[PDB]
Each structure stands twice: as C-alpha cells, then as structure tokens.
Amino acid sequence: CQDVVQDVPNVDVQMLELYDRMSFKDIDGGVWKQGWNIKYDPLKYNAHHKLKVFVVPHSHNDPGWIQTFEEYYQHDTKHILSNALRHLHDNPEMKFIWAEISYFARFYHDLGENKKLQMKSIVKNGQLEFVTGGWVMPDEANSHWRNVLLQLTEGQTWLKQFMNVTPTASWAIAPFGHSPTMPYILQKSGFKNMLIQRTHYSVKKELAQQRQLEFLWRQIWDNKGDTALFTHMMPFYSYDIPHTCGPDPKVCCQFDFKRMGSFGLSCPWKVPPRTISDQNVAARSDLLVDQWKKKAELYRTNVLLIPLGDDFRFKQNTEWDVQRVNYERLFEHINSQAHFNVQAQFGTLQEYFDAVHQAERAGQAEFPTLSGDFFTYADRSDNYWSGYYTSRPYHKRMDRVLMHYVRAAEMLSAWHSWDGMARIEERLEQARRELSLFQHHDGITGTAKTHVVVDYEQRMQEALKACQMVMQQSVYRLLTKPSIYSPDFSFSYFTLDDSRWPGSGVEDSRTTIILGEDILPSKHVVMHNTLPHWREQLVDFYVSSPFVSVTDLANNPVEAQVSPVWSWHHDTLTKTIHPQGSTTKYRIIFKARVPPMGLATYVLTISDSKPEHTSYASNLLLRKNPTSLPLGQYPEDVKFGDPREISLRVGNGPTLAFSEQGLLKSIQLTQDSPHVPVHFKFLKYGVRSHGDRSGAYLFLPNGPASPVELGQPVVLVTKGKLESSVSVGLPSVVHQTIMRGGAPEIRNLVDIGSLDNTEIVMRLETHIDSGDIFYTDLNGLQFIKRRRLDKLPLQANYYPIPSGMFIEDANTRLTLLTGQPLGGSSLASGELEIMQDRRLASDDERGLGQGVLDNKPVLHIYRLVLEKVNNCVRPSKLHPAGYLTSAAHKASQSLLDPLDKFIFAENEWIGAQGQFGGDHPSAREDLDVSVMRRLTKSSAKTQRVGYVLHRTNLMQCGTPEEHTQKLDVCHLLPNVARCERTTLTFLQNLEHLDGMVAPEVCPMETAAYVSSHS
C-alpha cells in the first residue's frame, strides 16, 4: 500500500500552494472581464496543423429548482427529449449530450416501443451521448461521498440495463465549486475524463495563463498518481453560449441563434444574432473563428471544445432548426476556406476527449498534474458562494439521516432473497432514487424555491418510510425461528425509534413503550449495528413508567439509567425559555452491545418499585425565579439553584466545566491534567445595507459576527451514572452538551424564528496555537488542509463542513464532528466556527428570485473531541492532507451511522431470537462496509451481492490496537461460487479473485466486490 502520511506528492499545481501565491486581484481584463486580451499567432495553424473544433450541443436540466422535478418534466424536459429524438433521428450529423438520468429514465419509460427503438438507435450510433450518467448532476460541497456514489450507480445501472452504455466522460458544468471526491469516485468507476466549470475566476485566470486548464487531477495524498483523472476546466464565467465560444461575450452571443427575438431572448451586449446567409457568412465566420482561435490559446492541443447550450435549451423544434441550420452554414464555409485552417463539426464530449488524447499520444502535448479542491467558488468580485454550505439546514440534516437508513435497509434485507410479494426491491429503489435526486445541486444545497424544497422533503419522508418498512421486515425474518416465521409483508412488526431525527423539540414522533400491571409486563427491543465491528453504544427509549429494568436475551440484567423527558418551551407569557418535565413518560438508557453487521435483542420489564439494576438521574434547574417541576412517579425530586458554574464527569472520562450560562468553558482530559480552555459561544452575522446582499447562495456578511445577547438563560443539569447533560435555552438555540464517558455530544435545537437578515454561528474558542491553519473534510471522505487568507474576505475563508473540522498545534487538537453538512471556518488562531442557520430577506441575483424565509426548527448534532497529539505520527508541514485519530473517527461514525433501534409492535413475539451476526468477523476499526446490496432478484439461479469497502486512514499515536479478524466480504453469505472485484457501481468486473477471497483495501482506498452464490 501507498503511504498516505509521509510522502508529500510532487504535483505541478497544488491548490493550497497556488492559493498562498495568488494575489486574487479583480481587475477589468477587457471584453473577457476576468481575463486579458488574448493574442494568437495567425501562422500557428496551417494545412499540416489544423484546429479541430467540436461544437457540443447540450441542455442543462435541473431536477427541481424553481419548479419541481415533475413540473419541469411536464413543462420543459419531456419536450426537450421528444424533440431531441425527432431532430437527431432526422439529422444524422447532429449531436447532443445528456447528463440527468432521473429525467431520461422517466421519459424513456413512458415512450412507446417504436420510439424506444428509435432512441436506442441514436444512442448506439453515437448521436446522443450520455455524459456522467448519474441520476443527477450532484452538489460537490455538502454531499456525502456515499450518496455521490449512490446517485451515480442509480443512473448508470439504468443506462446499462436499458441503453447498454456506461459513460466514461463526466460533465459537471453547474455545481458551485468542485471536489476531488468526484475524480476519486469516477476513476474507480471506469471513467477516463471529466469536465468542470464553476471555479473561482482568479483560478481560471491563473491556470489559463499557464495553459493548465487541462490537468491530471490526483488525490492530495497520492504520491504515485494512480488516482489521477484527466480533467478539463472551462475557462470563462459561464457555460452559456455567450461564454463558451471565446473570450468576448458580445461576439459569442451573436452565435446563439435563439436570441433573435421570437423566442423572447436577447443579447445583453446589444448586438443580436443574424441569420447566416451567403452574403454574411464570410464576415460571420471571420468573427467566430477569431473567437475560437483565442479560446484555443488557453489550451495545449489543436483540438477545441465548444459547448453549445444553456438551461432547458432545445425545447422547441424551431430552436433545434435555428441552431443547427446556422451552424451548418458556418461549418460549410469555414471548412472549405483553407486560410482558416479549421475543421469544425458537431461532436460529443467523448469525441472531444478521444481527439485530445490522440494529440497527446502523437506527442503534441504534455499535461500538468494537479491536486487540491476548488472551494470556495466566487463567480465575480467578492461574491463567494459559501452561503449554500448552510442554506436549508433541516434538509441537509435529513440527507444524512436518509443516507444511513438507505444503507441499513439495503444491508438488513441483503441477507435473504425476498419474494416479489414482499416489495423489498420496489421500496429500496424508491428510497435510493429519492435520496439520489436530493444530491442535485439545487437540492441538498438549499438553493430551491420553497415549494420545491417541500417536494424534496415529501420525497425523502416517503423514502424514510420505505426504509423503515424494509428494515423491520428484515429484523423480523432474521430473529424469528424459521419454522415459526409467518410474514405479512404489509404489517409493521417493529417500529423504528430514532432519538435524533426529527428530534426532541422538532417533532413529537417517538412511540412510548407502554407497560403496566394491567396491560403489558414487558417489551422486546432490537438494535442493529451496520458497522463491521462489535459496537457498544448507549441507547434510549421512552417508557411509561420509571420502574423499568433491562435484560439481555440470556435474561442477564443490564445496568440502566432512567431520566425524565424534558421539553423546552418558549413561554410567550413569562418571556422565558424553560424546560417542562413529563409526569407520565420517562427515558430509559442502557448500553447495547451489538455484533458486527448484526442484531441484539433486549427486554424491558416493569416492576412496582425501583429495580436493582436501574439508577435515576438527578436534575438541577438553575435560574432566578424557579417554579416547581413535578415528575410523577420519578423517584428523585428536581433541585433548584441560582445560576452558577458547574463541573461534570461521567465514568472515567473527561471533566467538563460550564459557565453560569450553561456553555462549555473547559475540558480536563484526566484527573491530573490541565483544565484546557474550550469555550462555546453563539454569535450572529448580519447583511449589508448597501451593495450586494446575502441570499441562498452567497454569504456577504456586514463584518465579523457579534455576540448573541444571552440575558439570564435557564440551565438544566441532569446527572446520571451512565449519562449526564447540561442544557440551556438561549435565544434561537436550545444548546445541549451530553456526556456518556468519552467525547461529549453537542445538540443544538435551532429555531431562528423571525430573526430577519441573520446568520447564527456557533464558535469554539481555544488557546490552541493553530495560527492560520485548519482542516475540513471533503464529502466525508478526506480531510484537507485549509489556510485562512487575510487577503481574501471573511466569506472566502468559509468552507463546507460536510462531516468535520479540526485545528491543532504541536500538542493539542480540537475536532468537531458533524451530523449534517454546514459551513464553517477558523477565522482566528485557536477558533473553530460552524454556521447553524441563516434567514435572509433578499435575493442574491443568482436566479432563485427569493430570499430564505422558510426556516424551521432543526436538531443539529455534533461530537467534540479534544486530544493530545504530541505523540501522533503526522504528515509533514508541506503535506496538503490531515487525518483523524481513532477517537474522532469513531465519534464521526456515532453521528452518521448510529445503532438502529426497533420496538416490537405486538404484545408477544413468538419464536424470538437473541442475536444475529455473532459469527460475523469484527474488522479493523479503519475499515467500513459502506454498501452491502443484493444485486439479483429471487428468480436468479446465481445470486449476487455487492459490497463497497472503504478504508480510511487514522493517525498512529501509540495505541497498540490488537486482535481484529480479516473481513472477507465474499464469504459473508454461504455457498460462494465466485468473487469479483468490480467498479464501484458494480457494473464491470475488473478481477476474478482466487480462492473467492476479497482482499482488504489499502488506507484511503475504496474497492467493490461482488460475490456470487449457488
């Protein structure tokens, strides 16, 4: 395996280094506003060296944005596709590329057989070419790599089945900045080329000047270069026609033949297109070829890409005609006039890349190597697109919840073949497709109209319900004696209990386990562990009595803690935010121990009095002017006091100190160690009163954040043997620090209410000497080194925090792990901050035509890990990556893939079993089975199961960490007949594996395997 820590890769362009060197001056470059006046030598091209030009027609189709998916389909996309089919069929030389398979699949499914065959023919003959072939063109900032892969696989699996094609070129013209997670996944999915567009205008200028817009994009840790993917960055401000023909949009706009008037479009530069005629074709060609030759100056080969399209283009037959006929007249003239030395034609994206590499192999070009990312994007001036790292955070959190439910449903149901009547495949396809759709660059990004956000939410809720159904049917089958198992495939044998979604104070959604002498003495519950190692985790359930005890399914007592159910209320009479306790419902908490990829059953039993193995938390309400807080049968009376500093320790874990406002002030790791200053603070950013306004996309703060005025908040302290917590009702946030013996969990119930033009940030202040360095993750896959740059505005220093961030010095590290993607930064040495929500009155002139005023309460979840790192083997100062410790990685897993909890619905579970998966291998902590998916329906003689295995890289810090078993996924199911290494989409077999043994992957690597079973 490659060493991902100790070898700094040697690349021609390293983005962090480039950022350090660049001046980012925003000067008027002339007609190319953000470039310079391009000059070319007319003698560069001649009879023996022509410029080959590929004009590639396209239509960007958003699967929801200002209309819903279905609205756009009915109003626009179905017409675009119908007319593409007609026009390509009738015009053999015309070409078209298509990206969004969600739309194509819908369209194709609805076609009659005659037209299906016509469609297959224009694909087979190369006129219509699929680019990327994902369900959507995903966001690259907020999306988790697992969901990027999910959506890619959904689109490509459809394409292989129905169109018999698998794209090897990717087209990403629209995401708001670009992540190296894309080439990582694409290169491991058979791709050979990719194209990107939305990168900072200063980066475009810098790379264009050096002819570094085409590069071999490798991962930041990759010393050898085996991850490299050829990447083409487009040079100009937009992917529209005015910004794709060459540097002067006043000229290029004249070659968008939809802009002459009858279509309701015009040219901003006030010179319209004119129909090409015999009397103007020479002058028109002069102008166009001059633009092309200028654009060609920015690249290294004699092969030029000219995209021809825009959003929802090619809708009407007349538009197809007007573009095609005019371009054909230009081609006929240009190609026949030797003096131009140009050969121009309609082409596809693959045709462009094939020609580029032909030129490369002929020895006419060598390409630079590059590592890094392309965040944070700015399209002009100081307009940095860091707002969408946070916009609509409820749905960003929902994404991560659904991500896990899809994984768990696919895994739990994979163990068996299911009858068609069970509707397992149907429900899983629904769930995968809704989650995939949300990866769209107007979905998870929070940049859609309110009614479209509501549509995505409804789709995701349906998907969650589908997952639940599949999960609970699977648990019932896995844990019931086979000769007793009698499934009704519509029945709910278990209900899922989720303690963090939608969350306390967001929705009262969980079911109370109702026990009583005169109703039901006991209840079975089951935990699932999707991770491939034994896991212990505290779990909680609501119960109708505090006198409940827990046993395992050997009837062994399990230590438990009972706590009250606390709900916070904004009291509109007293004008205070204060907690109320239930007098009929209680929380029972205990440690569940669950096999790798397995299930464990426990029993909750009522008694008339305090059980031997159950303890009760104390509760202390700190406020001036307290009133009584009765708790029914709960055996411990609530205590009251004036606000004061408090200190808590659970188990042998850290000791946490809190201010009188209930906010963390210090962490003491051990009994003898220092009280390390770690302060939580809430602040607010505002909006500018002049100039450009923040909106769904842009973050344009009116200076540094100002502290939120806290007043005298009510603080609730719960102290238990297993779990303790401090909660405080702040303006807009109920902030909760939870201690279970390791790194604390932080929960924020964020309700920005009616606070207009406000962004609420949570900041951590420490004395860690981090300087200008911090680390943030990319798509939950890797941690990249960031440098705060004072030459850039505050909003430019904001990055996506899709799963975590950290700061460190020689001795100490503070890591904040997240359960939802949000924006964040380190704006000063020793600080971390992460945006919670934003409510914005104005539009930011990027097309949405609304602000963000549809905020709703959301429960954000985090883990906070303070660690000593003086003993850790870390990358050198010049290495662009960082790596988590074991504790931080496990903390991230606790947020993203918690235990699943099931409550048996009926009174008695006949044939119940105690455990599933006790014999599953417990793999090394850095290895995950990211995907387990049965690929075949029940009628297949040879069953196939697909696995995606990911190994992260954790720092070596002196912990021996011994005794784990080799995980061979190909032997997880019995009767294996073959094992193949495949592309990550499972669509191509790459290696036939000897002994039918799937070898474990290297650090930072991801591999897919398919086992076949007789």
Ligand SMILES: CC(=O)N[C@@H]1[C@@H](O)[C@H](O[C@@H]2O[C@H](CO[C@H]3O[C@H](CO[C@H]4O[C@H](CO)[C@@H](O)[C@H](O)[C@@H]4O)[C@@H](O)[C@H](O[C@H]4O[C@H](CO)[C@@H](O)[C@H](O)[C@@H]4O)[C@@H]3O)[C@@H](O)[C@H](O[C@H]3O[C@H](CO)[C@@H](O)[C@H](O)[C@@H]3O[C@@H]3O[C@H](CO)[C@@H](O)[C@H](O)[C@H]3NC(C)=O)[C@@H]2O)[C@@H](CO)O[C@@H]1O
């Ligand atoms: C529907 C419609 O007809 N809209 C027109 C607006 O487009 C137009 O406003 C201008 O929008 C340009 C961007 O348009 C493209 O993006 C739209 C947004 O959707 C896509 O992006 C969003 C993110 O932004 C993303 O979420 C989503 O998924 C999607 O991918 C899209 O709707 C547009 O397409 C529609 O309209 C065009 C015609 O306009 C049709 O051809 C399409 O088929 C479709 O109906 C486009 O794809 C912005 O670039 C414009 O800003 C420039 O211009 C204004 C002046 O108007 C300046 O103030 C700005 O500074 C900016 O100037 C540019 O600056 C750079 C850098 O200096 C220069 O290099 C460049 O040359 C400058 N351009 C100009 C013109 O000076 C603008 O906001 C308005 C036109 O007034 O009319 C409609 O509302």
Ligand SMILES: *[C@@H]1O[C@H](CO)[C@@H](O)[C@H](O)[C@H]1NC(C)=O
């Ligand atoms: C599918 O494509 C493969 C290779 O691209 C080809 O060999 C095969 O004939 C095709 N099958 C059809 C026509 O469905």
Ligand SMILES: [Zn+2]
């Ligand atoms: Zn778009």
